[PDB]
Scaffold this active site. Sequence first.
Site, short mmCIF file in Angstrom:
data_model
loop_
_atom_site.label_atom_id
_atom_site.label_comp_id
_atom_site.label_asym_id
_atom_site.label_seq_id
_atom_site.Cartn_x
_atom_site.Cartn_y
_atom_site.Cartn_z
N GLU A 197 13.11 -2.92 -6.85
CA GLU A 197 12.82 -1.83 -5.73
C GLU A 197 12.65 -0.70 -5.98
O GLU A 197 13.51 0.14 -6.56
CB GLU A 197 13.86 -2.08 -4.51
N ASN A 224 3.56 -9.78 -0.15
CA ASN A 224 4.18 -10.55 -0.16
C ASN A 224 4.79 -11.28 0.50
O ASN A 224 6.26 -11.96 0.15
CB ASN A 224 5.68 -8.75 -0.55
N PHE A 269 11.64 1.10 -1.77
CA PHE A 269 12.47 1.59 -2.40
C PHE A 269 13.78 0.82 -2.22
O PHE A 269 14.56 0.61 -1.06
CB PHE A 269 12.93 2.89 -1.25
N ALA A 288 0.63 -1.25 0.07
CA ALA A 288 0.18 0.11 0.18
C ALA A 288 0.53 1.54 0.20
O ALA A 288 0.93 1.78 -0.71
CB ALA A 288 -0.51 -0.24 0.98
N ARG A 289 1.70 1.33 0.81
CA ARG A 289 2.13 2.73 1.16
C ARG A 289 3.67 2.90 0.00
O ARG A 289 4.31 4.28 0.02
CB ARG A 289 3.37 2.61 2.67
ZN ZN Z 1 7.41 -4.28 -1.19
#
Ligand code: ZN
Length: 312
Positions: A271, A140, A195, A67-68
């Site tokens: 990522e 995940n 990230f 989500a984030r």
């Molecule tokens: Zn992720």
Amino acid sequence: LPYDNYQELEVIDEYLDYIGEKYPDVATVVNAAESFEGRPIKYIKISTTNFEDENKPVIFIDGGIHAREWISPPSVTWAIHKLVEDVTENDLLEKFDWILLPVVNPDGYKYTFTNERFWRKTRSTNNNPLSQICRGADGNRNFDFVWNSIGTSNSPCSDIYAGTSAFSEVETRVVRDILHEHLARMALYLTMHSFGSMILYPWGHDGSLSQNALGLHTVGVAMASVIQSNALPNFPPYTVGNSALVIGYYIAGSSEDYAHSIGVPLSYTYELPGLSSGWDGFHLPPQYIEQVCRETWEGIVVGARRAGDLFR
Ligand SMILES: [Zn+2]
Ligand SMILES: [Y+2]
């Protein structure tokens, strides 16, 4: 257009419906299922041959499991823009059929907009009363790959909660059903996250190489390389390699590992970039969104080409 801002769920959804309606001869939107809360989960099917010529391998890309990680979905919709709206790599439609799921977890995405910006799980509850308080499961960590063996928590309130069972989440079941239905001809699987500027490949549970390590690390290095020469001077360099060894920790239940365990030859967890080491990393400054989407598309171009070679 506005790749100048992180868009609301409804906007992303309406975009697929726009592509589907404007270019029906090449794109087809399918409403997989309903999220736990009732929201439609959608992906788009791009093919110049209506997915009929099975001699054309399949490229599957998805984002929004977490989500984030807001930069994830737009990178997927930018690939949709480049495949249908502004086609500058014609060979990609000639050679492959494509499936793109911009937001696998819509209840969690919306929730980072309406309630908590850094929520990552889904928003499901179950027969267990405590799930009334502790909702969702880490998507995940939900795939059936040495499920719940490592990188998780049995507390339903943990952000690394694996779910009640493998694929207990309908959002995760949608990704599963795509993998299996197209497994026969899937040349590459990219699941977008954030990230760290990384391109990761199996195995994530023990950090060991799979039989296809050479190809994996060769096509990644080649994707990471094209990104680098298209990136902005201030962005960090991409790191390619084994998921666990790069990310620094072991994780069970990923979609990338799961896809690999059933045969998809090339499957990576992208990522995407972040510019701050803390929670800020999940919010790459908006002025960069169109750039990161653009450069990431150059990575996807090289990787779909290399994966096509290696599949034949
Ligand atoms: Zn992720
Ligand atoms: Y909370």
